[PDB]
Structure 1
Amino acid sequence: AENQYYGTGRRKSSAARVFIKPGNGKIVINQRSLEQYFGRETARMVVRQPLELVDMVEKLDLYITVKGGGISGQAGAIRHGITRALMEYDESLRSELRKAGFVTRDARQVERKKVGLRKARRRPQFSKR
C-alpha cells in the first residue's frame, strides 16, 4: 500500500524506476516525451503493451526514470517496471503478468571471460603441427 506505487523493473542489467498513479493516460520517460526518446521506434509499442493488456493505457499516469542498458532494452525493462508496480488492482495480477511473461526477468546470467580462452568458452584456435 502506497501514495504512488512503484516498480523496479530490473531486466538484463537495466533498472527501470517507474512510478504509477491514477490520472488521464500520460507518459514521462527520462524527463522527456515518448516522442523524444523513442521517436518512430518499435520501443514505443513495448512500453505500451502491458498498459493496453490489463486495459489501463488511458487511465494510468506515469513518471519514469531509467538507467543502464540499451535503448530498445530500456523499453523492455519498463515492461517489468510497470508490471512490478501493479500487484493489488487484483490479487491474481502479478501471477497473470508473469504468465503473459511481462514480469519475467531474463533468467540467463553472465558468464565471465575465462583465462587461456579468447572469450567466455572459445578455447584458442590452433592447427599447430
Structure 2
Amino acid sequence: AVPSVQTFGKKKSATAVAHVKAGKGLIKVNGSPITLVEPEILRFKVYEPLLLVGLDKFSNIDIRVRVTGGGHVSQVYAIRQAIAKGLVAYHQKYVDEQSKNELKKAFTSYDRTLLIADSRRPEPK
C-alpha cells in the first residue's frame, strides 16, 4: 500500500494529528490549504518549518493535519509541531537518514520546540 506516517503535536491543550504520505505536494489543514490558518498573524509561525528547511521535500510529500482543542495560539503551535515531527518521521522511514539528520539539525538549531514539547511543569520554591 501507500507510504504513510502519523505524528502528534501538542501545545497547552491542543492536539494535532499530522498525516504524511507520498503525494503531489499539498499541505491541507482541516480540509483547507495551509495558507488559510486562522489568526493570520501567526501564519508565518506555522509556515516556519517549510521556510526553515526548504520546500522541494514538501513537493514530493503530501501532508494532512487535523487539529482539535486549545485556543488559537495553542492550536497554531500544535500545528507547527505536528508538521515538523511528521516531516522528520517520513524522511526517517522512506528516505536517507542523512537527510533525516540534516532536517533534525536545522529544526533544532532554529527552535527546538518544533520537535520536543515544552512541558511546563511547575516550580515550587
TM-score (norm 1): 0.67
State yes or no: 1:63 paired with 2:64. Answer: yes
Question: How far, CA to CA, are the matches of 1:16 and 1:27 in structure 2?
Answer: 14
The 1:99/1:78 distance shift into structure 2, 3 A limit, reads same
Task: For residues 54-91 of structure 1, give each alpha carbon's deviation from its aligned partner in whole angstroms, at most 9, with x where no partner exists.
Answer: 11275132111111111232121111101112142524
Question: How far, CA to CA, are the matches of 1:52 and 1:32 in structure 2?
Answer: 20
Q: Which residue of 2 aligns with 1:97?
A: 107
Q: Which amino acid aligns with 1:21?
A: K
State yes or no: 1:11 paired with 2:11. Answer: yes
* Deviation, structure 1 residue 37: 4.5
TM-score (norm 2): 0.69
Structure with more helix by fraction: 2
Question: How far, CA to CA, are the matches of 1:35 and 1:91 in structure 2?
Answer: 26
4+ residue segments displaced more than 6 Å = none
* Deviation, structure 1 residue 97: 2.0
The 1:99/1:48 distance shift into structure 2, 3 A limit, reads same
Question: How far, CA to CA, are the matches of 1:22 and 1:3 in structure 2?
Answer: 6
Determine which structure has more spread, i.e. the larger CA radius of gyration.
1
Task: For residues 87-129 of structure 1, give each alpha carbon's deviation from its aligned partner in whole angstroms, at most 9, with x where no partner exists.
Answer: 4252423354233222131231368xxxxxxxxxxxxxxxxxx
Q: Percent identity?
A: 28
* Deviation, structure 1 residue 8: 0.4
Asked whether the 8 Å contact 2:9–2:78 carries over to 1, the reply is yes
The 1:91/1:110 distance shift into structure 2, 3 A limit, reads same
Q: Which amino acid aligns with 1:3?
A: P
Question: How far, CA to CA, are the matches of 1:56 and 1:78 in structure 2?
Answer: 17
Q: Which amino acid aligns with 2:18?
A: V
Question: How far, CA to CA, are the matches of 1:73 and 1:10 in structure 2?
Answer: 8
